[PDB]
Amino acid sequence: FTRQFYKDKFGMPDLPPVDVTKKEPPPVKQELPPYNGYGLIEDSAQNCFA
Amino acid sequence: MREIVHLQAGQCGNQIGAKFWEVISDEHGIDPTGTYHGDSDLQLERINVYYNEATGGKYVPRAVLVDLEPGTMDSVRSGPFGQIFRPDNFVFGQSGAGNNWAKGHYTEGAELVDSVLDVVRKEAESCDCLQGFQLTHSLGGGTGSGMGTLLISKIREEYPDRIMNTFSVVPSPKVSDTVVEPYNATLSVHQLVENTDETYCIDNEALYDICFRTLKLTTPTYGDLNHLVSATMSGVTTCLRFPGQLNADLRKLAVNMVPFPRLHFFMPGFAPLTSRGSQQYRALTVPELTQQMFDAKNMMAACDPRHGRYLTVAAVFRGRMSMKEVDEQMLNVQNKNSSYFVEWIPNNVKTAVCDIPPRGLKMSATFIGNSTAIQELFKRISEQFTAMFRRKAFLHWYTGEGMDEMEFTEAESNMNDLVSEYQQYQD
Numbered sequence: 001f002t003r004q005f006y007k008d009k010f011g012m013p014d015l016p017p018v019d020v021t022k023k024e025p026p027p028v029k030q031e032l033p034p035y036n037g038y039g040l041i042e043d044s045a046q047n048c049f050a
Numbered sequence: 051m052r053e054i055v056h057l058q059a060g061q062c063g064n065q066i067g068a069k070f071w072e073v074i075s076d077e078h079g080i081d082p083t084g085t086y087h088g089d090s091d092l093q094l095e096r097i098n099v100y101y102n103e104a105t106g107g108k109y110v111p112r113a114v115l116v117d118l119e120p121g122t123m124d125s126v127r128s129g130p131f132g133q134i135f136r137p138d139n140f141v142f143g144q145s146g147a148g149n150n151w152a153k154g155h156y157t158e159g160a161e162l163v164d165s166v167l168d169v170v171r172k173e174a175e176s177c178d179c180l181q182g183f184q185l186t187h188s189l190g191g192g193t194g195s196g197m198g199t200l201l202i203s204k205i206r207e208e209y210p211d212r213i214m215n216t217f218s219v220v221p222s223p224k225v226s227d228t229v230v231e232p233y234n235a236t237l238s239v240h241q242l243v244e245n246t247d248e249t250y251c252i253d254n255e256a257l258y259d260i261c262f263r264t265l266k267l268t269t270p271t272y273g274d275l276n277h278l279v280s281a282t283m284s285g286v287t288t289c290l291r292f293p294g295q296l297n298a299d300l301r302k303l304a305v306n307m308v309p310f311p312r313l314h315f316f317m318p319g320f321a322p323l324t325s326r327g328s329q330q331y332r333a334l335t336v337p338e339l340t341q342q343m344f345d346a347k348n349m350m351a352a353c354d355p356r357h358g359r360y361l362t363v364a365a366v367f368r369g370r371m372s373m374k375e376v377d378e379q380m381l382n383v384q385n386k387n388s389s390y391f392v393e394w395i396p397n398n399v400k401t402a403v404c405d406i407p408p409r410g411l412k413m414s415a416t417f418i419g420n421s422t423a424i425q426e427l428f429k430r431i432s433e434q435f436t437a438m439f440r441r442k443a444f445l446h447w448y449t450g451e452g453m454d455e456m457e458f459t460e461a462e463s464n465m466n467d468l469v470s471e472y473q474q475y476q477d
């Protein structure tokens with residue numbers, strides 16, 4: 001309503017809103033401490049999670 | 051020069067021969083093919099303790115395989131390193147094992163011992179001067195026992211001046227699968243102890259307990275167990291091939307460990323086995339190394355030495371160490387449990403410090419100690435043998451093969467003598 005009121009009464013062109021928000025990057029998940037040599041390259045993954 | 055030739059016997063002598071040789075080859079950077087890819091000058095320099103050197107830089111492992119059923123030999127053959135093994139050494143017979151100690155000791159071996167002896171003395175002549183031979187077999191396993199008893203018996207007179215190092219798997223006390231296993235064990239142990247000087251006792255249950263405890267992986271393969279035991283053996287092997295302050299000699303260990311003529315049976319233990327998050331959750335300090343190093347749970351041979359004490363102990367450590375930390379930890383362990391050792395020889399501990407680390411982790415070690423930790427094992431086998439023999443079941447097979455029970459009597463007699471000797475010395 002404001003930006004259509006201005007376009008005729010005060011005769012105002014377009015003024016789009018500007019994103020005034022604040023942002024942050026994302027983090028990353030914990031990976032696997034590499035193959036110790038004593039385990040299994042696929043089962044030790046499931047084992048060493050939580 | 052000092053060097054060693056390997057013998058793998060039985061259908062688990064296969065097991066471990068495969069795993070052990072492949073582990074060493076990966077340590078030394080030899081490809082699965084054989085073309086040496088030199089990256090560690092020292093191991094290139096001292097490869098001769100195990101390996102001859104062939105053209106173009108491949109190295110025969112001076113190891114010999116013995117079995118009866120060609121399928122297992124072909125399977126290990128098919129393994130990633132059967133090509134680095136020998137068509138030369140691939141001697142084998144035609145019969146079926148029958149899992150029969152009697153047949154193995156009298157029928158089947160009677161046409162294989164000849165050829166295998168020819169091969170082994172061929173290799174002995176080929177090389178300069180052995181320290182001896184390491185033989186990997188089973189005591190409960192039928193044909194492994196049947197072969198190995200006769201083989202060691204003959205090589206005893208063949209060379210009375212070398213190291214007959216033997217490695218044996220103890221039957222799971224909870225189950226032997228094969229029900230004649232106690233009979234095979236009582237048959238074997240007599241000649242085993244009579245002929246050998248040093249014997250390694252290992253049991254499957256404790257390795258399974260380790261797998262639950264720190265491996266925590268819940269999906270183990272006997273191959274993973276073999277991976278462990280290969281590292282175990284490598285631990286005591288590293289000394290000879292490596293420089294720095296360390297008494298490497300197996301005869302050194304023998305004269306520092308073996309108090310009496312007939313004490314031979316020893317129990318292993320090893321150093322950091324890294325868990326799920328201990329990789330980044332464990333600080334590698336001599337205190338914690340010794341802490342886990344001398345622990346009941348990490349022990350994996352037979353049964354908790356909580357009941358008994360330790361006659362004598364020996365420990366070798368791989369990495370950049372110094373004497374003060376091992377010294378002070380020795381003081382602490384002596385002053386902590388003044389009773390838990392035998393007064394029979396004060397300061398019953400031996401140390402060794404390999405300068406060379408393993409490839410990937412900084413500090414490792416090997417434990418080996420002689421204790422009163424076999425009483426329960428052979429008393430167990432005593433009750434089993436007595437209970438099954440009192441009605442002489444499963445014995446007509448052996449009568450057909452040509453046995454009699456007087457040898458059973460003398461076997462159990464010698465074994466009870468071992469019990470009595472242990473008890474009277476320590477207790």
Ligand SMILES: Nc1nc2c(ncn2[C@@H]2O[C@H](COP(=O)(O)OP(=O)(O)OP(=O)(O)O)[C@@H](O)[C@H]2O)c(=O)[nH]1
Binds near residue numbers: 060150193195
């Ligand atoms: N590589 C390998 N070895 C095994 C495995 N499972 C058990 N073994 C053990 O290895 C033992 C020893 O085998 P051998 O020394 O070849 O015994 P044998 O005189 O040839 O005759 P058997 O006792 O009937 O096998 C067997 O009794 C098994 O208990 C496995 O899954 N893989």
